[PDB]
Chains A and B, each alone.
Chain A
Amino acid sequence: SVSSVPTKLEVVAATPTSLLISWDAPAVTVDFYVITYGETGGNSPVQEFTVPGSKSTATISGLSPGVDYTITVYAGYSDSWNWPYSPISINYRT
């Protein structure tokens, strides 16, 4: 069991086209979070957006019902690609 930052990623609410997600903030400062999301497996490229490190929630929009999605959240840092924590990911079908 690998740790990750952030840790407790879950869908708080779902609609046919949206997923409201949330996670637990770590003890440490995170500058921003990158959220990527894409249809599980192939075939499309993932979409992505970022939210401030002060956030622990986000809304993913423009999805299609009955589709399996893989959602990944990275803890990111200014002026650096030395992101030291494993991202966290979940699967969810609308």
Chain B
Amino acid sequence: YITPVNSLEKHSWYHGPVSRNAAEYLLSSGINGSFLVRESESSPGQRSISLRYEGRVYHYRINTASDGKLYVSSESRFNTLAELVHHHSTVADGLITTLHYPAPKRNKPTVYGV
């Protein structure tokens, strides 16, 4: 029932099993370049970037190449997710803007809210 912790959650920018909709909430008091990386709860391995720019949140799928490399743009592929994020932290390479400010992690919700 409770999702195990992913090793990638050591990164300030990787928030784990978070939906598109929860990501928008989590980024609602961010600035240009605020972002997080998330995985799908139901079918993990499918990761996304959510990025804030001029008051809107943009969502991008992270693709897996046939040799296992990860990319947003097929022109810039990497061995690891961390390498990809570090790349896009100075080179937009398709993204509306660069990945500049990892969103602060919040306590998981309870029935009483968040």
CB contacts under 8 Å to B, within A57-75, are: 72, 74-75
* Chain B residues, Cβ within 8 Å of A32: 109, 111-114
Main secondary structure of the interface of A (DSSP, over half): loop
Number of interface residues of B (CB under 8 A): 25
- Report whether B2 and A79 are in contact in the complex, using a CB–CB cutoff of 8 Å: yes
The verdict on B21 contacting chain A, using a C-beta distance below 8 Å, is yes
- Report whether B28 and A78 are in contact in the complex, using a CB–CB cutoff of 8 Å: no
- Report whether B15 and A81 are in contact in the complex, using a CB–CB cutoff of 8 Å: yes
- Report whether B114 and A79 are in contact in the complex, using a CB–CB cutoff of 8 Å: no
* Chain A residues, Cβ within 8 Å of B16: 81
The verdict on A16 contacting chain B, using a C-beta distance below 8 Å, is no
**Shortest CB–CB separation between residue B100 and chain A, in angstroms?**
17
Interface residues of B (CB under 8 A from A): 2-3, 15-19, 21-22, 24-26, 28-29, 38, 41-42, 55, 108-114
